Amino acid sequence: LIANQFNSAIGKIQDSLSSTASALGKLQDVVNQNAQALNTLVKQLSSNFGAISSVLNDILSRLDPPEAEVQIDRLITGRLQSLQTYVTQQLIRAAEIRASANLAATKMSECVLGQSKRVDFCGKGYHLMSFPQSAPHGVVFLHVTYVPAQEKNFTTAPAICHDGKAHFPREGVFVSNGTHWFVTQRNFYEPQIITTDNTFVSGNCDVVIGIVNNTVYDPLQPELDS
Amino acid sequence: PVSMTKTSVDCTMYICGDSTECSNLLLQYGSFCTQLNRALTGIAVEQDKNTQEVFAQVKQIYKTPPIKDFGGFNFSQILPDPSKSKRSFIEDLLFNKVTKFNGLTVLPPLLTDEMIAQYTSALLAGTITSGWTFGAGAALQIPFAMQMAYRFNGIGVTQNVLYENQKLIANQFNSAIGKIQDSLSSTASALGKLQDVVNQNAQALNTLVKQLSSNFGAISSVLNDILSRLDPPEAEVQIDRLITGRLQSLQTYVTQQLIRAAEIRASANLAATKMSECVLGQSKRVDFCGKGYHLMSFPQSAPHGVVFLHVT
Amino acid sequence: NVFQTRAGCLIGAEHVNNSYECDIPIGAGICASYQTSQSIIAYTMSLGAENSVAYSNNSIAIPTNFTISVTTEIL
Ligand SMILES: *[C@@H]1O[C@H](CO)[C@@H](O[C@@H]2O[C@H](CO)[C@@H](O[C@@H]3O[C@H](CO)[C@@H](O)[C@H](O)[C@@H]3O)[C@H](O)[C@H]2NC(C)=O)[C@H](O)[C@H]1NC(C)=O
Ligand SMILES: *[C@@H]1O[C@H](CO)[C@@H](O[C@@H]2O[C@H](CO)[C@@H](O[C@@H]3O[C@H](CO)[C@@H](O)[C@H](O)[C@@H]3O)[C@H](O)[C@H]2NC(C)=O)[C@H](O)[C@H]1NC(C)=O
Ligand SMILES: *[C@@H]1O[C@H](CO[C@@H]2O[C@@H](C)[C@@H](O)[C@@H](O)[C@@H]2O)[C@@H](O[C@@H]2O[C@H](CO)[C@@H](O)[C@H](O)[C@H]2NC(C)=O)[C@H](O)[C@H]1NC(C)=O
Ligand SMILES: *[C@@H]1O[C@H](CO)[C@@H](O[C@@H]2O[C@H](CO)[C@@H](O)[C@H](O)[C@H]2NC(C)=O)[C@H](O)[C@H]1NC(C)=O
Ligand SMILES: *[C@@H]1O[C@H](CO)[C@@H](O)[C@H](O)[C@H]1NC(C)=O
């Protein structure tokens, strides 16, 4: 059953990617931002900044150096300011991309090379593993996670008394279908008889709040009787 | 801190307010306005993205049951009460401890404070009634005493330690919440982090505006005054000086905003991580969730930011 | 036909009493979307279907089945 669910889920990923493309907005946004930065940088070349003509050779020809100097100096100031603005945009955007790259490195080291227990760090749900896939200027993870599905409203109790002593479940929780009592692991209903092995004793009936009487079976009574 | 104030600045009405000659001069500098406007809009949207990532992590909007059988713990100082702004008490203490002519529009945040309060009440009700499970899938209710049993057993302390000391732990937790209430209500230098962001942006705006009253080497800092006092064959030069000056001031402000917004986004991603790992579950990263072994946490909104109560 | 929001003056969208997920953000919590002959409506976005967990002092809900989702994360 797990195999079939995992295969079908991979298939749904295949389809989701193949049909809609707004899932890859993150990479496309970086590419478009840099393309527009370059296009603005270039289109700044066609501006006068208060000079005569946006072409350099044209100013060198149309005038004399005693004024081509001033016109040029204006163009140089303008283009230099535009260039610094572009480089500052690039510095900031590169700091941000380095942030996402360190984050991806962490996510691959903790989420592929091992199984993590950081909630929602590796896809919504309990984390099982992940597989990376390349993508143009970036990475794409497939967080294979485990999600509990369909529950039941059981009745519980923090401990049970059998012989005056309190009994707490070793690794599980005490549930009851209204008729009997069982101890079951927290994440998957799999009831078990409450032996003296599933539980461990402590104190007496007095102190815990909400305890319920019951009979904790003991595996030694059969052999001891026989 | 989670978000700045979404500010937008019309380049033109700033640099060349109501002077056609000035606008037509500015057009010679090219696409600087388009660039600055696009940058400030990028920031102004990243803010709403930040708040979205920090708070909107719950799929539904849970609600505590009306009765309050929580094994003896008392959450009335953090759960909402309908008697106000449907916020809670400590959210109020937080909201009280924190205290236009030139295109300086201040857009409103997409999530209004009531909706932020509803998100945080949802996360709080989920953590109270369902443990961490509401962050892994469908919320599964479980008596609070047992949830603290699991939280203990998670840090290497068997359950009977909790069950035998339930009343003592309840009293300690209630009294600690009370001390938080007092600590916030009396001193206010605990909220220095949010107030510092607000003041930094206020001073940035005030410097931007007070740059309007500078000559940059021109005749008079007023535009119409230069247009009147002289002729275009010299008003052009005087203006061009004013435009260069105001444009430089505007770029400096927008660069300050870009950097400060990168920093606030750093703190917002950190808050998102801290809420996903520290509320929606119990962490084992030392000192990541308050000094000590970590038991759980409850978030509380605050003007442009979040405030956790790491119960450890 | 002419709505007045805490963001500004919306022109050309009906103001509904309903509440759906935010499709196009506006501000101050208002979100607009194109829906049913149809038109553009501007509502106050809803945060999700409210839900009251049947909490008690002795009721626990345990799963019986599981599903293996496979999500994607792009960086
Ligand atoms: C736990 O959940 C899984 C969910 O996949 C359950 O398995 C699925 O159960 C449904 C309902 O019976 C199956 O659908 C039916 O499949 C049969 C196969 O011949 C078909 O005749 C029906 O028309 C319908 O499609 C589905 O196949 C099945 N999935 C797998 C992979 O077996 C599973 O039963 C649940 N566990 C428990 C204990 O309920
Ligand atoms: C573990 O530490 C806790 C710390 O709270 C201990 O509980 C506290 O113990 C002090 C000392 O006895 C109590 O103070 C006294 O309370 C009585 C109550 O009537 C009063 O008559 C005295 O004047 C004094 O105030 C305090 O109440 C108590 N706190 C609680 C919540 O019970 C606890 O005893 C320690 N455990 C062990 C095993 O020592
Ligand atoms: C849980 O059981 C205790 C005691 O259990 C009794 O003694 C056991 C050895 C076994 O024979 C059980 O069937 C008995 O019920 C109960 O404590 C008693 O409560 C009664 C009041 O009904 C009181 O008269 C007795 O003195 C108490 N003590 C004993 C030793 O009987 C307790 O009430 C039970 N609780 C629940 C929720 O069932
Ligand atoms: C939980 O704590 C609140 C206070 O945070 C308690 O409310 C107090 O109740 C007493 C008795 O009714 C009053 O004297 C106080 O004035 C109340 N204070 C406030 C701030 O309301 C409440 O009793 C505690 N217990 C429960 C079960 O809610
Ligand atoms: C739960 O609350 C009901 C309400 O009266 C009470 O009768 C019962 O004893 C309580 N049980 C526990 C374990 O708190």
UniProtKB/Swiss-Prot annotation, chain C:
Residues annotated as glycosylated: 17, 36, 57, 65
Disulphide bridges, residue numbers: 22-31
Effect of residue 33 to A: No effect on O-glycosylation by host GALNT1
Practical use: Main component of the anti-COVID vaccine Chadox1/AZD1222/AstraZeneca; in which the human tPA leader sequence is added in N-terminus to enhance protein secretion.
Cellular localization per UniProt: Virion membrane; Host endoplasmic reticulum-Golgi intermediate compartment membrane; Host cell membrane
Modification comment: The cytoplasmic Cys-rich domain is palmitoylated. Palmitoylated spike proteins drive the formation of localized ordered cholesterol and sphingo-lipid-rich lipid nanodomains in the early Golgi, where viral budding occurs.
Effect in UniProt of substituting residue 64 to I: In strain: Alpha/B.1.1.7
Effect of residue 52 to L: In strain: Omicron/BA.2.12.1
Similarity-based family: Belongs to the betacoronaviruses spike protein family.
Note: Variant D614G has become the most prevalent circulating sequence in the global pandemic since April 2020. The mutation is associated with higher viral loads produced in cell culture and animal models. It would not change pathogenicity nor neutralization properties vs vaccination. May be prevalent because the mutation increases virus transmission in human population.
Domain comment, as recorded: Contains sequence and structural motifs very similar to those of a bacterial superantigen and can directly bind and activate T-cell receptors. Activation of a broad T-cell repertoire may be involved in the hyperinflammatory syndrome in acute COVID disease. The KxHxx motif seems to function as an ER retrieval and binds COPI in vitro.
Name the record gives this protein: Spike glycoprotein
Gene: S
Shown residues within the full chain: 641 to 727 of 1273
